[PDB]
Amino acid sequence: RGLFDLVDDWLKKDRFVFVGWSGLLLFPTAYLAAGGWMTGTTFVTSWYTHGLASSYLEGCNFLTAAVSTPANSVGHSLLLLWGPEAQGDFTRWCQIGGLWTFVALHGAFGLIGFCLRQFEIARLVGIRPYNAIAFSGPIAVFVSVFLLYPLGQASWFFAPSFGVAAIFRFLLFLQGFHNWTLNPFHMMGVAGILGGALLCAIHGATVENTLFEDGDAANTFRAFTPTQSEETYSMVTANRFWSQIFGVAFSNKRWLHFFMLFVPVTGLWTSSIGIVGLALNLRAYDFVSQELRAAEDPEFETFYTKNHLLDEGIRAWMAAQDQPHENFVFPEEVLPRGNAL
Amino acid sequence: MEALVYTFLLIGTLMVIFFAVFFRETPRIL
Amino acid sequence: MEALVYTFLLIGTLMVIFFAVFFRETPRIL
Amino acid sequence: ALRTRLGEILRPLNAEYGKVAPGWGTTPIMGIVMLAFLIFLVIILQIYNSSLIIENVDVDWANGIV
Amino acid sequence: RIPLWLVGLVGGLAVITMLSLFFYGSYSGLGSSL
Amino acid sequence: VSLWERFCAWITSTENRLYIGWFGCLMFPTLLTATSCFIIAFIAAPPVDIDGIREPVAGSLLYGNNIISGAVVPSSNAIGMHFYPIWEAASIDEWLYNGGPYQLIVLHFLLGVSAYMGREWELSYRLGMRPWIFVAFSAPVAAASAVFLVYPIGQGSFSDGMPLGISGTFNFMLVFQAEHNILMHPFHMAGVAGVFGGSLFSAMHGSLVTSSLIRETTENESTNYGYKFGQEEETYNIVAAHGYFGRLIFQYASFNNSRALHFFLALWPVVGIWITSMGISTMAFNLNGFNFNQSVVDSQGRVINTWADILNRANLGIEVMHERNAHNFPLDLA
Amino acid sequence: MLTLKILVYTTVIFFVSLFIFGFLSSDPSRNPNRK
Amino acid sequence: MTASLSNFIASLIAGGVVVGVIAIALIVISKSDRILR
Amino acid sequence: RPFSDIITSVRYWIIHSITIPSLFVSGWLFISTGLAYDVFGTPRPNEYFTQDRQQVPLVNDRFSAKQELEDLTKG
Amino acid sequence: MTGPNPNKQAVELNRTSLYWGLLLIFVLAVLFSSYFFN
Amino acid sequence: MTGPNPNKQAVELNRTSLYWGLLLIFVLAVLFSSYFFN
Amino acid sequence: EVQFGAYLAVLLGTFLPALFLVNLFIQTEARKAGKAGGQDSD
Amino acid sequence: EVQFGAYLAVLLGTFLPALFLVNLFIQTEARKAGKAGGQDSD
Amino acid sequence: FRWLAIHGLAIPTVFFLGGITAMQFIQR
Amino acid sequence: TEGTNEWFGVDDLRLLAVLFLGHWAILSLWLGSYGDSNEDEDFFGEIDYSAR
Numbered sequence A: 001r002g003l004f005d006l007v008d009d010w011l012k013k014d015r016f017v018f019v020g021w022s023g024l025l026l027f028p029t030a031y032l033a034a035g036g037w038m039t040g041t042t043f044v045t046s047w048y049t050h051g052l053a054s055s056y057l058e059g060c061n062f063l064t065a066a067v068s069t070p071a072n073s074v075g076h077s078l079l080l081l082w083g084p085e086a087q088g089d090f091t092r093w094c095q096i097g098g099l100w101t102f103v104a105l106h107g108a109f110g111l112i113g114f115c116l117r118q119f120e121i122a123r124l125v126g127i128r129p130y131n132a133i134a135f136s137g138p139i140a141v142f143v144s145v146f147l148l149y150p151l152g153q154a155s156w157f158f159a160p161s162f163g164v165a166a167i168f169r170f171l172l173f174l175q176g177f178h179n180w181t182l183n184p185f186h187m188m189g190v191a192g193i194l195g196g197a198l199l200c201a202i203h204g205a206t207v208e209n210t211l212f213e214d215g216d217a218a219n220t221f222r223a224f225t226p227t228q229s230e231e232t233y234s235m236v237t238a239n240r241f242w243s244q245i246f247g248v249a250f251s252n253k254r255w256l257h258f259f260m261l262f263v264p265v266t267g268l269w270t271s272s273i274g275i276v277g278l279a280l281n282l283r284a285y286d287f288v289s290q291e292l293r294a295a296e297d298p299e300f301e302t303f304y305t306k307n308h309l310l311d312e313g314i315r316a317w318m319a320a321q322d323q324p325h326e327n328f329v330f331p332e333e334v335l336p337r338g339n340a341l
Numbered sequence B, C: 001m002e003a004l005v006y007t008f009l010l011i012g013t014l015m016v017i018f019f020a021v022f023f024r025e026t027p028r029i030l
Numbered sequence D: 001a002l003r004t005r006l007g008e009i010l011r012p013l014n015a016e017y018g019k020v021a022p023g024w025g026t027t028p029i030m031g032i033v034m035l036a037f038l039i040f041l042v043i044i045l046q047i048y049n050s051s052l053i054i055e056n057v058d059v060d061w062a063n064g065i066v
Numbered sequence E: 001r002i003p004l005w006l007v008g009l010v011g012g013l014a015v016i017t018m019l020s021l022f023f024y025g026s027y028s029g030l031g032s033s034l
Numbered sequence F: 001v002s003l004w005e006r007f008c009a010w011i012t013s014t015e016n017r018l019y020i021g022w023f024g025c026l027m028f029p030t031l032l033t034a035t036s037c038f039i040i041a042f043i044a045a046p047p048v049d050i051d052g053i054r055e056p057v058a059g060s061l062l063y064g065n066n067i068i069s070g071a072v073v074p075s076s077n078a079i080g081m082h083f084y085p086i087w088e089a090a091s092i093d094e095w096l097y098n099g100g101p102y103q104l105i106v107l108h109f110l111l112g113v114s115a116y117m118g119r120e121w122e123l124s125y126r127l128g129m130r131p132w133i134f135v136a137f138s139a140p141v142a143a144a145s146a147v148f149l150v151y152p153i154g155q156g157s158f159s160d161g162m163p164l165g166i167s168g169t170f171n172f173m174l175v176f177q178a179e180h181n182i183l184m185h186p187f188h189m190a191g192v193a194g195v196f197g198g199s200l201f202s203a204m205h206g207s208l209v210t211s212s213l214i215r216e217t218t219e220n221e222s223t224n225y226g227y228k229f230g231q232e233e234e235t236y237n238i239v240a241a242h243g244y245f246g247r248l249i250f251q252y253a254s255f256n257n258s259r260a261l262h263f264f265l266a267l268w269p270v271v272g273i274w275i276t277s278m279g280i281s282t283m284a285f286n287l288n289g290f291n292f293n294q295s296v297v298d299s300q301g302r303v304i305n306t307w308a309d310i311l312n313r314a315n316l317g318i319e320v321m322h323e324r325n326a327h328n329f330p331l332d333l334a
Numbered sequence G: 001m002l003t004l005k006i007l008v009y010t011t012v013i014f015f016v017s018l019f020i021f022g023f024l025s026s027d028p029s030r031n032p033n034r035k
Numbered sequence H: 001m002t003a004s005l006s007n008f009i010a011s012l013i014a015g016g017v018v019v020g021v022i023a024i025a026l027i028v029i030s031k032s033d034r035i036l037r
Numbered sequence I: 001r002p003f004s005d006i007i008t009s010v011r012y013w014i015i016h017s018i019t020i021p022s023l024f025v026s027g028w029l030f031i032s033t034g035l036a037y038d039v040f041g042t043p044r045p046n047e048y049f050t051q052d053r054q055q056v057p058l059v060n061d062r063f064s065a066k067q068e069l070e071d072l073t074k075g
Numbered sequence J, K: 001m002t003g004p005n006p007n008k009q010a011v012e013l014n015r016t017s018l019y020w021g022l023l024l025i026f027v028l029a030v031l032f033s034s035y036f037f038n
Numbered sequence L, M: 001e002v003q004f005g006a007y008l009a010v011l012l013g014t015f016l017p018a019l020f021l022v023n024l025f026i027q028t029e030a031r032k033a034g035k036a037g038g039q040d041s042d
Numbered sequence N: 001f002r003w004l005a006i007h008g009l010a011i012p013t014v015f016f017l018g019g020i021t022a023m024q025f026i027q028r
Numbered sequence O: 001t002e003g004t005n006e007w008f009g010v011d012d013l014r015l016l017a018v019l020f021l022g023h024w025a026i027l028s029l030w031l032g033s034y035g036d037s038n039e040d041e042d043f044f045g046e047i048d049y050s051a052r
């Protein structure tokens, strides 16, 4: 009837890719985060920001290419193309590291626009919105690492660059400087990721091994029409199996599939709380009862004090080349070496 | 004195594992 | 640090006196 | 369903429930306010970020009068 | 009309000429440490 | 009638509380000895010379540790790969000094887990099930035997084996990074994709079932009570969750087949952990990951740094600091 | 220490022999199909 | 009136036409592709 | 129209037998004519270091960062 | 198992005897705290 | 007072969800104790 | 200087027996609401 | 040297929430024994 | 029409692969 | 003496009598049912369901 109704009926039309209202936020912003990454890893260097090479023009393969974080002198500037740093020039915008905030900002509005996509399709199909709530897990890892972690730090420079090996140094930068593995929020996150991979490997292998005979063929994939009301696997058998192997087992398909939602997602929320606590440098660095004892008793050694000496090697050896803006000129005689290494 | 708490948490965790396996609410059809 | 426990015991005792007077199980004939 | 003296005063404030303005109403007036408040938040963030420089406005610890 | 398996054959060996070209330039040109 | 037939009838009975089976004849004595020695060695065990340099590393709770730092320490560098049981130790005090209980726990563990795996086969045979849950459990058995058995073999000592603890795990992972460069190795890459993908398709499948549940309860009681146990009606509209994901990405990327869907949940992690556990295995024999250090040069020939060179300087920090007294010669051959 | 050692080889080849003579005890025929 | 303030309002105008040319194209095509009753 | 009916048709491969080589070679000429080094400012292998500047160039200012990169890219 | 026990009973505690037992514990906690802290 | 509330409901917790919630607390007690004792 | 095991004596001497007596009252009222058959039994 | 407020953190972090979850189970079984009407309802 | 949907993703992809094959033959 | 090349780790003569009486003590149990059966009775199955 009205003008709003014609636009509402056009976006929600059955077509190849469902656009909806949320596609106006997703499809422009996701196309430019992805294309900003493919351009930045192919053409744009890191020679002026980090003093590296992170492009395909500079000989890096898929692994050692990245869209890199800007300089520490930029601080937390948004680095707009028209801004006071770039001033409209495209070429000087790329050399400062403007594509990285271009990827991260238009990417953050892609994950907004993709989670709104999951509320919109669920309302048209008419189902409960648990996909949009389980996808809030990965939103809490993008925001609290690519956004909330460099905000608490000195600049955008201490953020993960969007490249394969550039994530890998961020894994190593976070052990030596922060002792991230000791943090109980990672420990509750590893329990959800390795726990979530566990549940789909079991529920994959128990459904597929309690199937009913619905055909004479040896292939069991053929014997399932999608609109049938009979269940395709014996729940009573699978309960009787695991009650004797493992001792305790699900007797509820509604509780089972909810539990496959809770376990992976909670590991992304609990691990997201800790990385917000490392923006503020509130790290779980030391057990002081272990540290006061190892200072007074020069014979008491645990595995825990062995990890601190591994972190002095990370804090001293890479920090010269890690942070060229700070100009660490270490002598050879201050770098902690071991015996004969 | 400090390690006494850690031991009580560990064997206390193994108690509720014992009760969950053997005193489980046995599911029944009908 | 020590007197904080004594205060919590005293005002905690005055709570259950408050609930016993006003939220009492009112006795009823028949 | 217990009439109190304070309940009698406030009763016309709750007596309406679910009356609507028929049509689109004041929705286009609201969006012009929401478009305006979106521009306001962008500006005061960029002042704070030093990505929008205003003359005689310096984002630094200033001498408040003592 | 073209048979579909001819299409996946010609495009499939076209990818091998693209991939093995990329593993070629790991040992020559830039990024080869020569 | 015979005594053996009345014993085979009991040991293979599915009417027991826990199925014992013929693999339980060597699962249960193995894993109860790995357990009962682990609880004692984690709580009360004296310090252990791990580096073979007579610097004993404390690992138990009574010697001032906690849950995180306490660990069953691996055996000595002095022993190395030699089999060191209690009777070949001339006292228990000499046994506990040189890293005794690490070999008693690990060898009774790998026998009991490889028997727990065959026990999952056996009950599937006696219950009429198709058999291959135990093939999915091969993936953590591959990974448990990679860090406790295969990596001490190729490195030639159980002292390079994984410490049974929590802080000892991260001593294992970091030293393995400096000496082998696991992150650049494509088999750790193929299993990070296995568990990121595994936790994706777990929470992606578990949401689309819970989204499309059928009304069987009221809003006061729980959602889960609309499933009566052993019912034959399907508890969720699978056509509904197919039409949702058929619009969320596109139409042809959606499994309408629930059997092929529930197979892909078992394929992706298990193949990802088979491949990963043969990353530790091929890096046990010093076939390390990629090494792109000093790979990008200018026309003058000066080394241009990459992200691998920054990653190298993190590896050089752990390499020059791990086992800071055990080395005497310029190259860590072990 | 040579008294403990005797005790272990009893316990090992007790349960190993239950394993070996378990599957020799017509073990494929113990299925829910027939017998 | 500064360099930074003049460039920002120009981006605000440029942010209007990006929303604009998407919106103007979307109204016209929504007329042609209406659904039969 | 179904997707597999498109790519097996001849009229599809009539159009895209011209457009694919005319677009792949334009991606070749975008590099071999040295154009990509000037749009994105990526250093050529000749020009990581210069005769004067022998260190690693870094930006060391918030607001004159455009002017400092005008310095480090002339020589 | 065996059959259900005919000696199953129920436990009761009215609202009156709750406040006795609460006040009994807090007054013993007030009294004996000063000696335990010493 | 006034009348009885028609929004009275009952709270349930089966034996299954007891062992989840017990094990949830003890494992969080095992995990976070070492940091609290420091 | 006070004994640091007295905090554990008092605060568990309060809470553990007092939380016990609450439980015997809650299951008392649940049995009375259980038999009564209206709106709360379930 | 350990923090003496951590004993109060852990042992109340165990007992107070774990004694809570016991209470929701005891009143659950009391309502089921309350409706059932035999030998235990009262 | 869906010619704008695919070719916003495929016309760039062939253009960048025209550049990635050219970078294999570039040396110092 | 650990690295001696001795069969099954049998260091002393006493450990043999442990091994022989372990395999045989269960072998004799096994022969109480599956022993003393007809060693000449075949089948054209994949699997035999003969007797106990």
Ligand code: CLA
Residues within 6 Å of the ligand: A024, A025, A028, A029, A032, A078, A079, A080, A081, A082, A098, A101, A102, A105, A106, A109, D035, D036, D038, D039, D042, H011, H012, H013, H015, H016, H017, H018, H020
């Ligand atoms: C809808 C999709 C969308 C969204 C949400 C964003 C969002 C963003 N872009 Mg982006 N962009 C998009 C599409 C989008 N873009 C497209 C399609 C292109 C290609 C042209 C770009 C190209 C682009 C570049 C090149 C840059 C950004 C940047 C930015 C960021 C800051 C922009 C800013 O401050 O806004 C300011 C604008 C507004 C707040 C708009 C408000 C509009 C008001 C409400 C109405 C204005 C009316 C006006 C006063 C009168 C107009 C009259 C006229 C119509 C007749 C922000 C995260 C910058 C960035 O991230 O830097 C790192 C940056 O440099 N974008």
Ligand code: CLA
Residues within 6 Å of the ligand: A034, A137, A138, A139, A140, A141, A142, A144, A145, A170, A171, A172, A174, A175, A180, A181, A186, A189, A190, A193, A194, A267, A268, A271, A272, A275, F173, F195, F196
């Ligand atoms: C057994 C090993 C193990 C395991 C399982 C984990 C598990 C985890 N670690 Mg950990 N870690 C470990 C060892 C381990 N760690 C060690 C040894 C170290 C070294 C000290 C670290 C250091 C470390 C750090 C430094 C961090 C983690 C983080 C994490 C979390 C992963 C975050 C995640 O899911 O990202 C998944 C990624 C996302 C959710 C991002 C969103 C994904 C978007 C939606 C994808 C969109 C793509 C789209 C389709 C476009 C693609 C197309 C385009 C390419 C063309 C998880 C809890 C992170 C964390 O805690 O974050 C909270 C983190 O920052 N770990």
Ligand SMILES: CC(C)=CCC/C(C)=C/CC/C(C)=C/CC/C(C)=C/CC/C(C)=C/CC/C(C)=C/CC/C(C)=C/CC/C(C)=C/CC/C(C)=C/CC1=CC(=O)C(C)=C(C)C1=O
Residues within 6 Å of the ligand: A027, A030, A031, A034, F201, F202, F204, F205, F206, F208, F209, F238, F241, F242, F245, F246, F249, F253, F254, F255, F256, F261, F264, N004, N005, N008, N009
């Ligand atoms: C005209 C102008 C101005 C010129 C400019 C040109 C212009 C307009 C350009 C704009 C064009 C533009 C860029 C638009 C393109 C839009 C676009 C695609 C943008 C997004 C960008 C982008 C990077 C997208 C790619 C990422 C993408 C979405 C990847 C999808 C990943 C994928 C295929 C995953 C499949 C995984 C999979 C097999 C899952 C199933 C397994 C699983 C367990 C699912 C669970 C499950 C499934 C079921 O099935 C059912 C049944 C049930 C029960 C169930 O549990």
Ligand SMILES: CC(C)=CCC/C(C)=C\CC/C(C)=C/CC/C(C)=C/CC/C(C)=C/CC/C(C)=C/CC/C(C)=C/CC/C(C)=C/CC/C(C)=C/CC1=CC(=O)C(C)=C(C)C1=O
Residues within 6 Å of the ligand: A187, A188, A189, A191, A192, A195, A198, A199, A202, A203, A204, A206, A207, A235, A238, A239, A242, A246, A248, A249, A250, A251, A256, A262, A263, A266, A267, A270, B010, B011, B014, F038, F039, F042, F043, F067, F165, F166, K027, K028, K030, K031
């Ligand atoms: C005793 C001694 C000495 C101990 C010392 C040990 C020591 C050194 C320290 C260990 C201490 C310790 C345990 C620390 C853990 C700390 C830590 C990691 C905390 C995690 C806490 C926590 C809140 C984590 C948050 C993330 C989270 C919620 C993870 C949960 C992970 C988890 C519990 C997953 C469940 C996995 C599970 C077993 C599932 C399989 C279920 C299974 C039996 C399937 C059954 C089944 C499957 C089917 O498919 C079908 C069809 C049917 C029918 C069916 O039935």
Ligand SMILES: CCCCCCCCCCCCCCCC(=O)OC[C@H](COP(=O)(O)OC[C@@H](O)CO)OC(=O)CCCCCCCCCCCCCCC
Residues within 6 Å of the ligand: A245, A246, A247, A248, A249, A250, A251, A252, A255, B013, B014, B016, B017, B020, B021, B027, F018, F031, F224, K014, K016, K017, K019, K020, K023
């Ligand atoms: C030698 C081998 C013999 C088997 C060994 C036995 C060990 C088995 C462990 C028992 C799990 C008990 C947890 C109770 C859990 C409980 O009782 O759940 C009972 C639950 C049954 O759910 P239903 O379908 O009955 O529930 C339907 C509704 O009523 C939901 O409330 O079973 C599961 O879902 C358990 C599956 C995950 C199993 C979680 C195990 C996590 C591993 C243990 C983590 C703790 C280890 C800590 C050590 C420090």
Ligand SMILES: CC1=C(/C=C/C(C)=C/C=C/C(C)=C/C=C/C=C(C)/C=C/C=C(C)/C=C/C2=C(C)CCCC2(C)C)C(C)(C)CCC1
Residues within 6 Å of the ligand: A031, A032, A034, A035, A036, A037, A038, A039, A102, E015, N009, N012, N013, N016, N017
């Ligand atoms: C940045 C920027 C921009 C742009 C954007 C765009 C437009 C982009 C796009 C772009 C794109 C979107 C890109 C793409 C790329 C692609 C590629 C280059 C691909 C490749 C591929 C490959 C290499 C792969 C491989 C393979 C195959 C082929 C098969 C088998 C498998 C595999 C995976 C191996 C603008 C203007 C806004 C401005 C601002 C900034």
Ligand code: OEX
Residues within 6 Å of the ligand: F077, F155, F157, F159, F160, F175, F179, F322, F323, F326, F332, F333, F334
């Ligand atoms: O032991 Mn354990 O860690 Ca395998 O590397 Mn050589 O050895 Mn000793 O050093 Mn490094």
Ligand SMILES: [Fe+2]
Residues within 6 Å of the ligand: A203, A257, F205, F209, F262
């Ligand atoms: Fe499922």
